[PDB]
């Protein structure tokens, strides 16, 4: 049993020991007949004869006899064994030398005979996929096969190109993404697309994706995306040579194109990041750059290149060894051959800093050589003598101003030195150090001229001063220039260790622990009103800090509570759609960190942000349950600490899982009758008391229902004044506890207004409400309006509530005057101004802000003196605080239909305040995407929402221009479809993102249907038109796919109709026979495509682009489309192959995200094959179809589906049954 | 008081 194989091998070598050819042949024949009668297992006998150690091509007769025997006895082996025998036979035959005498060549064709038999498809001993994968594994792409086999192996590999084409995307190398701070992953070894299986793919798919990587690297804030793309984890010094080479080539490309400041800053930042995170070696990049630039010729970008090098040399020279920075001298020798003298540039231009880069580099190198002295000294370059003399003379002069860039040059040159750096730093920082008297911050152009080391020194000084002042417990406010300069300096991302990570992780906790409450308020206001680009995790971390600060530390002050509430609301509302899930999935363990205990308004705002993000991202498409998702625990813990109900109109727009969650978890509501009875009883009890302490204790007791604002309304409705006791109760209750009183006052106001007359009875009530807001300063306008708009009324009550909001906003002059003045005397580009503080004092002096009930304190029969000191205010006011509330009010007014007319008046009167909005374009994009069903009929409501915030059937030229704008934006044009914008301060990091969002907003604002918009967008390519040049059609398809994927569902659903129209076309329906595979039918890069095959190929390519740019939720409709629409209309092989080409390449995505869809797709493919087999007389592409099915089972599906496919396979015709017999196993 | 890339606000 165990020794049978050993005995067989012993008999084999005993037979092989003979020398008589006739005797050997007779023994072989005897073994052959013993095998054919079943005396020996075929696997064992073939393995023994082939793995016998005595077999060698010198024994020609023995080799030939053994191979004819294995050919005779090879037919009874299971396919796994057959595959192993194929592998060992190729391994053995690989050892044959190229030069062999022809006297034995005919004797060594027995191996070719057995390989020919085993690779015959008709016999079907094993699946052809095993044979092709073994052959490809032994012989990779581009390797010429062994001369004995040649054409056999070549053509056998050549018969799998149809399968390799099915499993490939059309024009994949020319599809580019949009970088926003997945499907674009790349191999970190050779920049290859990860290809599944060993199939003979196209040649272009085996080349590195240098173009794609370069395009990604050219965009700002692409660091995280490129790390994710290349699969780099911040855990070890990977030191990617490919990444180093790409960075060097990008620098060379930029210098060649030099023949702006933001661009060079972007490169300097990219090199800084990649050198810091142990992904590149600076000396290695310098040496490679030197080799690449040697013998290039004209080089005009030397100053910019040396500035980029200085940005790292100055920062890292403090600790890094001097040997690393040595090759810079050789690079200077190459790029600066002049040996005469360089003239000193004018010091009145920003370029002066760039022109002094080499002198600064040498100064730093000389200083480093002066430390740890001896070894080697760096002599003065002969050319750079005038520059050194100029710097020395500038340092010698003790009276130097900021009119020119002498300060910047000295700071850049002498940053490393300590003694020579005090004078320029003092001259630069005293003006902002000096509330202090400094009002003019450092200019943005001056800041851009400085180096990274100078910027870090400036921020370190500012942070140290802030910490020292906070620890000193001094009441002096910070310098407005200092705050503005800090806000400006916190934009650069290369200083993350000190800029924003140190601002959030250390500075804010230190100020919190120091009990400053003035520094903390200034920092929070600065974050709210001056920070533009913050990483999402930093934003969420600060949101958690804000929530815990509001909860604890006894911050029972009106101003601090208001600042925390407003800041938290702005961060919650400003979250991105694609960022919510990754940011909130980290807090899955403890949602209470990112949630709140008492701010029902903040929790509801978070819920609304959740709903809009899930709607835009199509997270819930294909699902009808909330369990198993990340939203479940967050919603449950929101229901804790905050039970609330959602109105019908505001709940009907939520996704299905959200609606299902909120149908249950319903909270009972206090009845209006009981509310009115309680208010009347509290008023009668208030008027029945005569003491003072008893009233204060009774009406300020915690746990009593919050009815005191209702009592204030009831009092001054009939007596038109408030006693001193009312002020005492308001002071005692506290700002944090007044929120519940405002919340109940909202419902009481709605009930009272609904149950009231018209005319005088409303004019009086609205005048009372306006007086309470402004004259008495009881409650602040944005808080009141937010609490009104966050209610849960129905129908008539909802109309009354929104009417109250509109009347409170527009009827009096108090808010309109403030908005008009702020808009008329202020500008939003805060980084280009010098007198913001003077404008701020002007506005605040004209309109003072009251937060401690000053008006009510004054209007008491004995006047009451308020002695609560104010925290400093630097940036914010009521107009800027009202913007998120106005966004929410717009959303509610859109949700309710009868109040659509009031929204037009509100926009016409208060639309100028959006000039100060952070992300107006993104806000409109989200608003139009979310409310498409509601606004698709009210076309006039749009063009009014769009015109107020940013500011006829179009022909084909309009759509062509719209696509071409994004095409040229992605390509890169010197004029550009859009003017140059500062990505450090704009909402859009890239012109591509800016153009995409603007185009989507413009398309959604049109008064035409989504079907027409989508059909026209596809028709731009699918119907021949002028001004659509060829040879760039792939990027046109890329732009169309991007736009249509960003567009809502009624816009990208037309692809299914287009696909069906192509399926039912005569090109695929005709029964005309073709020679060979119809390659040109499915290939868009063909010579001449008539019209019908042109339409088919272009439709395939457009579908590939759309489904490559689509999300998984949008891809979830493909299985249902395939099962319901395409299944009963596919009857021909051409249609079957077309569907295989359509859906084939995208199985990998389904495998990674959604498996049930993959199973359904496989079952649908098998049913389609059965339908085609039944309808057609015979099958001509059995081999491609079976190869694709085997590849599917062996790579994606596995043995997952067997029961649903056995019945289908058993009903096929005998030829297909013979081919597909191994799928069942 | 060296200020490099690998420094932090905490002394």
Numbering used by the authors:
A (entry chain A): 53 to 233, 239 to 316, 327 to 501, 516 to 1032, 1061 to 1334
B (entry chain B): 374 to 384
What does the paper say about this structure?
One function of Mediator complex subunit MED23 is to mediate transcriptional activation by the phosphorylated transcription factor Elk-1, in response to the Ras-MAPK signaling pathway. The MED23 subunit is the largest subunit of the Tail module and is specific to metazoans. The structure is composed of α-helices that engage in HEAT-repeat motifs, forming five solenoid regions which are designated as HR1 to HR5. The overall shape of MED23 is that of an arch with a concave and a convex face.
We report the high-resolution cryo-EM structure of MED23 in complex with the TAD of Elk-1, phosphorylated at three positions (T368, S383, and S389). We obtained a high-resolution cryo-EM structure of MED23 bound to Elk-1 (MED23Elk­1), in which most of the structure is defined between 2.6-2.8 Å resolution, except for the N-terminal region, which appears more flexible, as observed for MED23. Analysis of the MED23Elk-1 electron density map reveals that Elk-1 binds to MED23 through a hydrophobic sequence PSIHFWSTLSpP (hereafter referred to as «MED23 Binding Motif», or MBM). The binding of MBM is observed on the concave face of MED23, within the MED23 core, at the interface between HR2 and HR3 regions. In MED23, the MBM binding site is formed by four helices: H19, H21 (from HR2) and H28, H30 (from HR3). Within MBM, the HFWS residues form a tight turn in which F378-Elk-1 binds deeply into MED23, is buried and sheltered by the adjacent H377-Elk-1 and W379-Elk-1. F378-Elk-1 is surrounded in MED23 by side chains from residues I339, L343 (H19), F379, G382, S383 (H21), and V533 and M537 (H28). There is no extensive interaction between MED23 and this phosphorylated side chain, as it points outwards of the structure. A detailed comparison of MED23Elk-1 with MED23 reveals that binding of Elk-1 to the concave face of MED23 promotes numerous localized structural changes around the MBM peptide, which propagate to the convex face of MED23, modifying its molecular surface. In particular, residues from S327 to S336 in helix H19 move up to 3 Å, interfering with the interaction network formed on the convex face at the interface of the HR2, HR4, and HR5 regions. Consequently, structural changes are observed, with a segment of 19 residues (S1033-A1052, hereafter named HR4-lid) which becomes dynamic or disordered, acting as a lid on the surface of MED23.
